[PDB]
């Protein structure tokens, strides 16, 4: 197994409130090294948030989140974990695992993150409604057909897309998000393909929005 | 107490084949206890380089890092299409271990003008039957990046019922893609006949109209 951290976890709470986040790792001995969450705000560059020894006999933290938040580890299930509380506006942050490569407070191997989104305005986890994008003679020119999927009035960020479980990649553009004056996020991605292959592939689109756990897979016709 | 790291400046345009160099200030002498990390929107953050200067397994040898002190430096020699990215430097010498804001390198496109090819979806069926109307306006692979598309529906311009979206830069041809979405209540909606997505751009000596007549 190759080396893999996977974060999960992130989503909407109100200020005060608690969330949990996991990391689950794999394609390494896990319980070798030290592990570290690290973040990313709004408007800041990454903070260093907290540490813990290999052994777990230690734990550190940011002044900012000491008394607040609880790092601790499963060696046998090769699991990090960060107890939040008392979560406040400036908590905000995609959260990543990281892997300290040599003890020396600096990492090697990051998962992609989970977002963390602390709210008190009025809009409440909702996922989204996934609308296909059919191709058809209006989206097609020079032997290519462009479609896709509309994802539809989401809450809070983020949500992902991939083509047919990730085989699918050149000529894919999934846009950033909107804001909608509902206060719900909308996204569409497309992809243009062949012409000719609309009678004969399948074009499935992967929606997760695991802020709500929403999993979709819209298969787009023409 | 705690080190604070900065880095100058914050975004560059560069162009594919340059060299590149972007600097990292730490607030004290650190000695030669500074990694880079490059960040890409979505993507796990990467080490680079650890020790000021070594390179990290994989590490394509274009990168190379140098410094000592306060002041330390990340050079890419022929900055190639994958190297687009935000680099942010991280001390590991004391304290909390504090890392800079990030240098977004950008792309300093040369690149031909190109029009955008203009696409239009009706609202889906399933979307309808549930009460609301969104129509997709898609610009595919366009240079430059300035695009006016406007929504008219019966020939009527619209004001106030769309949204736009446009993604990052392609790093191998400098091109954008545009999504704009008119929403209206299915209501409004079948009120009308003719939808209309009308595009302007450097590309074009004047402006394109992609239509639908609503249920044809
Ligand atoms: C911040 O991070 C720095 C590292 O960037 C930490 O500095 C290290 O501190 C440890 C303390 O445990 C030092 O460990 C000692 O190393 C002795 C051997 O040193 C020699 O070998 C090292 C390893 O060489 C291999 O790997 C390097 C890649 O790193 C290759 O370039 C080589 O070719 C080899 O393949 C060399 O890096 C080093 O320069 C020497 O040549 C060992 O015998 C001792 O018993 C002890 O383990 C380590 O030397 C320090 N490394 C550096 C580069 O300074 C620092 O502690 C960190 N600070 C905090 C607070 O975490
Ligand atoms: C996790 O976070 C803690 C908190 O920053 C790290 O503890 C720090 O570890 C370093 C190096 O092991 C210590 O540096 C040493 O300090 C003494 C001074 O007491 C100095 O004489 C030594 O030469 C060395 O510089 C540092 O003191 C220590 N900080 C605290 C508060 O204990 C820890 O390294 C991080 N990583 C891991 C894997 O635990």
Redesign the pocket.
Known sequence: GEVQLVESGGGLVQPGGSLRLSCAASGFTFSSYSMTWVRQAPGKGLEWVSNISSSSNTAFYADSVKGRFTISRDNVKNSLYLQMHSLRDEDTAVYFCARDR?????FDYWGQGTLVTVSSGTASTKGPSVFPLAPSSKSTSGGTAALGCLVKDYFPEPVTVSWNSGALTSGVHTFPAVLQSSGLYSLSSVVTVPSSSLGTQTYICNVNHKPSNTKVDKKVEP | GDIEMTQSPSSLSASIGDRLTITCRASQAIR??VQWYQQKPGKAPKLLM??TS?LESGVPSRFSGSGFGTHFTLTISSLQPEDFATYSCQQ???GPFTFGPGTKVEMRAAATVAAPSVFIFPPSDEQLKSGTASVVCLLNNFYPREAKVQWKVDNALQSGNSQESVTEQDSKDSTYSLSSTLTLSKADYEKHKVYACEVTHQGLSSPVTKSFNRGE
């Open positions: 040599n003890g020396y407070n600096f | 030669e206890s650890f020790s070594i590991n010498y004391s």
